[PDB]
Amino acid sequence: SEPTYFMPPEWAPHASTWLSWPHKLESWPGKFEPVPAVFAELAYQLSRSETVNINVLDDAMEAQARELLKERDPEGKYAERIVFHRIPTNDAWCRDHGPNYVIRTQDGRRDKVIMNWEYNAWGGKYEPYDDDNAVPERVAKAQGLPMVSTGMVLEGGAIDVNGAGLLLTTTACLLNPNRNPSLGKAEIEAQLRRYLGIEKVLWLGDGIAGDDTDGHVDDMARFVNENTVVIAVEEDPEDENYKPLRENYELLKTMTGLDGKPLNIVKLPMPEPVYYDGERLPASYANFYIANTVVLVPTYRCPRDQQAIDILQQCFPKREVVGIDCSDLIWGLGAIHCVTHEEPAMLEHHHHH
Template sequence: MTNLFNDSPKKAGYRFPAEWVKHEATWLSWPHKEESWPGKIETIYTPYCQFIKIVAEGEKVRINVNDEETKAFAISELEKVGADLSQVEFYLHPTNDAWCRDHGPAFLLNEAKSQKAVVDWGYNAWGGKYPPFDLDDVIPTKIAGHFNHPLYLPEIVMEGGSVEFNGAGTILTTTACLLNKNRNPHLTKEEIEQYLLEFYGAEQVLWLGDGIVGDDTDGHIDDITRFVNEDTVLTVVESNPLDENYILLQENLAALKEMRLLNGKPLNIIKLPMPSPVIHEDTRLPASYANFYIANTSVIVPTFRDVNDEKALKIIQDVFPDRKVVGIDSTDIIWGLGSFHCLSQQEPAI
């Protein structure tokens, strides 16, 4: 481990920027796995393409596709919603599934050298839940090779949706996910922290507890608490005391209030509501407004045909006055147990 860290991205001057920093592109992996949306996959392409259309207004969209046939299908679906195809690039990188936040590349920047690097964490489909995942696991290495970026291989399991960044040295994550024995059972909490700090170029890790009910990732942070600037987080709270998310989200809120940033300041905490439970085929789905994606000119927020949709959109618009906040119906997409943030991964601009 010592040798690994001697040559870490942090020591080479790299760090993982905050999501609101200017992007060169957004990466996606075109959805094709019917088992991820059983009986519903044909219904997700319209909202998925609407998402691409909005993102493409301010940056490139780079999409991993399995083959030329998939590419042709993607183009036809994007044309239906009027997306600007001059902003969309396709890469023949076959995938198992669509969740690019978790299997895609972690792009790091060395601003002093104006250089980009890629971290390819190990990926095991959230603790081996959904094999096969061999194609997804090598996506970051393929992308790094295509663009000739330096590549780092930590050789432990880590997912992009499990970590949240303020761009000023702080990482926020959950014990429910990162300390789960289905990820890295050979590592202690302290050792996992060391990997995060060295491979993301950060200075501190702050830990929350559990994720929301229905989240098959074992508690990803991007469904509960998100940085919106260096010292402010949006965090979801449940208003109904009888709801099964109520207590765990109250516990997370209490933990956030105790946290201190590197400068000693407490977090500025803004509460987001939760939608009413979204149930499909007797399964509670992990519907959350926190799974928004910050693009260059917009913030895309999943909505759920719920009374709290407009309230959530207004709260998010208030913290992003320089971006257009757009709600896109995610009722069908969430059947796949994730939404727009889970599906996307930003590539920062140099």
């Protein structure tokens, strides 16, 4: 009758990782030049682990990307793994406008589909965003996958799942009137249950400073395994993020899984304050990306970088935790997790796996 869906956790096996090559000068006003190189570094690291699908506007852009990638991979050892797609984009925030892959189950059959949510540039802060909003459909077309549309605004960076029924989010973002004016909390949860197949929504509070997404959870807390959440915690009582992070840490310490058992909470440091043009930037180690063989963590040229990497290495002992300097990328108000979106690999023979 009615199908059910399943959203694999970020640590589940990937078929690939998607990226939207940067080109919007307005995203990094006055300092765009360093950005392309960061994406090349990211694409290179990802190509060591799995296929990398990159959205570009035209052949000229693809050439520019290939040149920068050649500096990272002079011999093209992993060149075959980087596949370009002529898919228009307005911004590079693939995490938020990108393909939200889910596994659909209906009448005993399972298939991979793209769950298309609406995108409105974090509450209408940027424009235009029609191409970003169309990315999921063009990806589905390119891969020949079915697409289901929800009609509700939702960014991938605003949610985080444990792959077993739990979904972590923030009231600051999902309940902000600038996203879904006509919807209330009950309706929003109903849609998350319906289209993502989750069972329990865990609502955290406010996000971090300098954040233009109105509190994305992916700049603060993330599931690392079925019952463990890593959360950034500021130790400087005078820092603006001290209070918000403290409230959410204490809240997490009272949250439980479906079994009613307390979730394991791992503390992560916050980067030392990052500024540009006299403005606080939303730098956070929680904005890391889990790939098949590596975990890519944004770093901000400070002694806390190695601390965050070591903690994440403990959380993912089977992977190589690698840092990528995001000192310039963060001027775009997002980092590694924000510019990526995994494509989970669905095994066709369910009885075998």
